[PDB]
Amino acid sequence: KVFGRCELAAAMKRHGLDNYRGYSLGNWVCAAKFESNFNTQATNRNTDGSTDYGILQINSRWWCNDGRTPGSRNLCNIPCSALLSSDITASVNCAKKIVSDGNGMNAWVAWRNRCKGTDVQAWIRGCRL
Ligand SMILES: [Pt+2]
């Protein structure tokens, strides 16, 4: 599923990401834009052999099991394929564990390099929330 910007902002808000660990909704929408282009089916291989999955590109190195990432963890206790659903519940629940682990949203390379320190409120402009 390719979400629209405001449809994803609404789903993320419903699921309790607005100001989760002090990250405004616009941070999460910006991160999804530059990680997945708002596409729940996005998958990308990392140099280390791990893969990133779904609308928030959650990494099989730590967070999910994809059956092909040796010596990795599954800290969200899910198959990585769960993260590709049109329903973002599993991605949001796992993202909440990730951002709580001490590094905050710096875990998302695209957030750090493209969203951090920018006017992220722009990502939710015009949306009925
Ligand atoms: Pt939820």
Side-chain angles (χ1 to χ4, degrees), residues 1-120 122-129:
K1 172 171 171 98
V2 181
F3 276 78
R5 171 177 67 93
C6 293
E7 177 190 20
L8 183 63
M12 284 178 156
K13 190 166 216 204
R14 221 228 322 147
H15 280 288
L17 281 184
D18 188 13
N19 287 302
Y20 193 85
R21 301 283 316 202
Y23 294 91
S24 66
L25 189 57
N27 282 289
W28 298 103
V29 173
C30 183
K33 170 64 175 176
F34 295 134
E35 286 292 358
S36 68
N37 210 10
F38 298 146
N39 181 5
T40 63
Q41 299 195 65
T43 64
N44 296 102
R45 198 70 183 260
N46 303 135
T47 58
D48 71 358
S50 67
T51 300
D52 287 353
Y53 295 85
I55 195 141
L56 285 167
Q57 289 291 280
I58 287 168
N59 191 164
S60 70
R61 176 56 59 201
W62 302 104
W63 302 108
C64 62
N65 171 45
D66 69 2
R68 57 167 204 202
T69 312
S72 73
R73 304 299 315 263
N74 181 9
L75 292 173
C76 289
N77 245 283
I78 51 169
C80 297
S81 68
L83 299 173
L84 300 178
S85 172
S86 62
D87 194 296
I88 68 169
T89 297
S91 285
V92 168
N93 290 344
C94 185
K96 287 176 174 182
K97 175 137 47 259
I98 297 171
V99 73
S100 296
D101 78 2
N103 293 309
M105 284 196 77
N106 296 293
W108 289 279
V109 171
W111 179 83
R112 199 171 70 236
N113 287 329
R114 305 182 72 179
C115 302
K116 185 182 188 178
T118 75
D119 178 24
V120 288
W123 287 97
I124 59 153
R125 190 148 307 148
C127 306
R128 295 185 260 254
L129 291 157

